[PDB]
Amino acid sequence: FRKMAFPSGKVEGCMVQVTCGTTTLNGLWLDDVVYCPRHVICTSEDMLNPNYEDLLIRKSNHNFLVQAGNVQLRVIGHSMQNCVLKLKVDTANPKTPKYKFVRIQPGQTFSVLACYNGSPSGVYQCAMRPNFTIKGSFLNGSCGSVGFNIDYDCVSFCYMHHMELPTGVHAGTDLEGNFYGPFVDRQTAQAAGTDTTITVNVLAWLYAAVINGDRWFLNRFTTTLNDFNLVAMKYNYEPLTQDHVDILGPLSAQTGIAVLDMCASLKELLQNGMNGRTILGSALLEDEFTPFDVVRQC
Amino acid sequence: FRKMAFPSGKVEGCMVQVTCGTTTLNGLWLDDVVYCPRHVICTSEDMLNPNYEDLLIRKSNHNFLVQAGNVQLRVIGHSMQNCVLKLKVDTANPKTPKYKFVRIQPGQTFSVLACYNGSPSGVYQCAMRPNFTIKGSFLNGSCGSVGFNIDYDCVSFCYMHHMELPTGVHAGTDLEGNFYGPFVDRQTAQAAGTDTTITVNVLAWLYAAVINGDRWFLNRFTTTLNDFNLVAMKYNYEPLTQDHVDILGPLSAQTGIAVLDMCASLKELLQNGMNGRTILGSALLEDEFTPFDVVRQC
Numbered sequence: 121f122r123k124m125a126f127p128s129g130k131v132e133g134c135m136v137q138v139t140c141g142t143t144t145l146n147g148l149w150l151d152d153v154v155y156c157p158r159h160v161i162c163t164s165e166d167m168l169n170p171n172y173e174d175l176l177i178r179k180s181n182h183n184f185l186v187q188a189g190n191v192q193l194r195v196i197g198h199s200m201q202n203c204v205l206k207l208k209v210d211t212a213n214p215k216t217p218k219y220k221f222v223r224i225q226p227g228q229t230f231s232v233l234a235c236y237n238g239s240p241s242g243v244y245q246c247a248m249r250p251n252f253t254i255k256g257s258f259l260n261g262s263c264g265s266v267g268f269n270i271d272y273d274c275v276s277f278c279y280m281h282h283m284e285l286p287t288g289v290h291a292g293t294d295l296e297g298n299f300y301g302p303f304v305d306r307q308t309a310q311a312a313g314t315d316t317t318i319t320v321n322v323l324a325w326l327y328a329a330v331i332n333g334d335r336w337f338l339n340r341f342t343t344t345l346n347d348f349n350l351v352a353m354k355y356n357y358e359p360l361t362q363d364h365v366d367i368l369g370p371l372s373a374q375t376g377i378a379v380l381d382m383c384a385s386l387k388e389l390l391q392n393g394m395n396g397r398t399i400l401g402s403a404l405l406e407d408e409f410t411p412f413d414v415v416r417q418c
Numbered sequence: 419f420r421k422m423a424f425p426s427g428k429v430e431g432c433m434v435q436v437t438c439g440t441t442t443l444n445g446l447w448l449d450d451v452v453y454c455p456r457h458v459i460c461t462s463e464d465m466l467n468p469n470y471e472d473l474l475i476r477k478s479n480h481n482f483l484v485q486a487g488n489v490q491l492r493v494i495g496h497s498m499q500n501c502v503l504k505l506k507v508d509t510a511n512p513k514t515p516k517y518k519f520v521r522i523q524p525g526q527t528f529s530v531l532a533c534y535n536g537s538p539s540g541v542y543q544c545a546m547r548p549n550f551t552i553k554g555s556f557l558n559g560s561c562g563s564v565g566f567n568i569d570y571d572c573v574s575f576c577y578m579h580h581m582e583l584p585t586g587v588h589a590g591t592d593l594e595g596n597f598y599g600p601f602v603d604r605q606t607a608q609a610a611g612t613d614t615t616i617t618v619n620v621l622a623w624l625y626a627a628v629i630n631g632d633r634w635f636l637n638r639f640t641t642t643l644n645d646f647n648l649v650a651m652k653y654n655y656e657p658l659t660q661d662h663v664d665i666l667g668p669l670s671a672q673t674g675i676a677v678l679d680m681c682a683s684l685k686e687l688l689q690n691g692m693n694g695r696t697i698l699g700s701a702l703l704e705d706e707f708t709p710f711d712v713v714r715q716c
């Protein structure tokens with residue numbers, strides 16, 4: 121098993137460049153609106169402690185250079201929604217897919233189309249960490265790149281990239297401009313909270329192991345969810361939610377292994393280690409494959 | 419530092435479904451020609467031991483059903499080039515990108531657009547193994563999926579997927595229909611030669627590790643190129659050539675770590691193991707990033 125991204129074509133056709141003065145980043149063109157980080161309105165001297173309200177009042181439509189490739193899109197309206205700028209343009213994007221805006225939970229995965237100057241450059245799968253960062257791969261110029269899932273030709277946009285943190289992890293917003301985590305769009309040092317292991321995804325990976333016949337870790341025990349959650353936190357593992365139990369349903373049904381029985385097998389692995397035995401050819405327990413990812417690849 | 423694929427939109431626009439009787443798989447539609455594995459002309463019985471020239475002479479254009487999404491493309495000519503069938507259709511693909519067909523060499527990487535019944539499903543990065551297999555992620559229905567690289571809006575197609583071997587690795591052809599490796603397009607158990615590790619790629623990845631702050635494996639030991647290659651060969655690593663050393667030049671300059679100095683680090687890793695430590699989060703030495711892949715991502 122390896123990480124696989126969604127085909128990126130439906131998002132590639134929406135990527136544009138947005139420039140304000142010399143400040144430049146990526147934007148997302150859906151119907152007749154371009155969405156982008158409001159940080160674009162900052163000059164170099166504004167980036168440290170921007171007053172976005174004061175910065176926006178000084179701007180008019182004609183101060184925004186929006187380009188699809190070399191082709192300018194004329195801006196006919198602008199507004200700010202939390203940390204995203206919405207630029208109304210005079211042309212509806214003919215490549216607009218069916219889409220929605222969603223806000224994801226930690227542990228959920230998504231594909232990232234990394235872009236530079238409005239030009240798509242690469243695609244890879246990412247997971248939202250419990251500390252609301254993502255361990256992405258981004259260079260300078262990537263601000264405004266988006267993350268997404270595709271379900272039955274509908275693109276669910278979930279992430280817009282804003283910044284890199286001092287630890288090298290990445291932070292951003294949903295497409296309504298609300299940050300994941302306790303971050304602000306200022307060029308100031310912001311540390312991520314202490315991270316934890318995504319339990320629901322480790323469990324998904326154990327189910328993937330069982331589906332593939334690697335099942336030595338299945339023990340003869342069960343547990344309650346509450347008991348498991350209390351032990352999990354002692355090992356820096358996330359507690360499971362009721363939604364987590366439910367999204368493990370399909371894998372539990374496919375394998376005949378009750379979710380709480382798998383929890384008991386994982387608890388044994390936390391309290392005793394793996395004894396130099398491997399699971400799916402890996403000595404480490406993978407935590408960036410969701411239950412949906414497992415059924416998708418198997 | 420992530421495994422990163424090229425944006426797949428230019429290739430998505432070219433995927434179609436090809437069917438002959440009950441047999442169906444993916445094709446690549448460029449201008450007025452659809453390219454697909456010639457295995458599509460086999461019945462269940464033919465697959466086990468096909469005489470392809472015999473099977474093809476017994477086919478007419480009307481025996482080929484090509485579907486592009488909802489629309490059927492009329493076949494007006496057909497021919498065979500090695501293991502690839504070329505179907506002339508009465509319609510040019512308006513989404514045809516600038517493209518070339520290239521045959522890649524062991525160790526080089528490419529993006530795979532995995533498709534099922536003509537519909538793109540996922541994108542990920544692969545390497546051509548020294549034994550001319552690829553460790554892909556492919557399911558039933560993926561026959562005809564292609565691998566590619568993109569340079570300045572030109573798609574270089576390098577791989578067309580044919581089959582999964584008993585070990586779970588994958589085998590295929592270039593777009594002229596010539597297999598990579600000693601395989602044949604027949605449904606019979608086929609083994610590959612013993613694989614080796616792509617040394618220049620391991621070194622590139624070690625540089626990626628240093629660039630991203632992971633330095634524990636460095637040492638003050640030295641080695642000559644020949645003495646490194648003696649140890650590498652002992653451990654079933656491919657030889658490192660002076661061309662490889664030259665290609666690693668930019669990463670040596672960026673990090674200030676001489677190539678032969680990084681060879682001395684790798685030598686110790688081969689001889690001592692990783693002592694339970696990880697590099698870029700991996701417990702094993704990763705060999706599917708080329709030097710160009712590392713430079714581009716870093």
Ligand SMILES: Cn1cnc(Cn2c(=O)nc(Nc3cc4cn(C)nc4cc3Cl)n(Cc3cc(F)c(F)cc3F)c2=O)n1
Pocket residue numbers: 142143144145157159160258259260261262263281282283284290304305306307308
């Ligand atoms: C290495 N890396 C990894 N991810 C990132 C993302 N990123 C970015 O692409 N750009 C940023 N600052 C800008 C500088 C500009 C210079 N010009 C001429 N134009 C520019 C546009 C931008 Cl956005 N930043 C920093 C950053 C961006 C924010 F949106 C924010 F709220 C705070 C920040 F500190 C950045 O992280 N780079």
Ligand SMILES: Cn1cnc(Cn2c(=O)nc(Nc3cc4cn(C)nc4cc3Cl)n(Cc3cc(F)c(F)cc3F)c2=O)n1
Pocket residue numbers: 440441442443455457458556557558559560561579580581582602603604605606
């Ligand atoms: C698990 N897996 C991973 N990769 C693959 C690729 N693959 C494939 O997709 N299909 C194959 N056989 C077919 C059966 C069909 C049944 N119908 C109704 N239509 C079919 C079409 C195909 Cl192609 N194979 C097997 C295979 C395909 C070849 F092209 C070949 F030369 C030898 C082979 F043994 C397959 O490997 N499956």
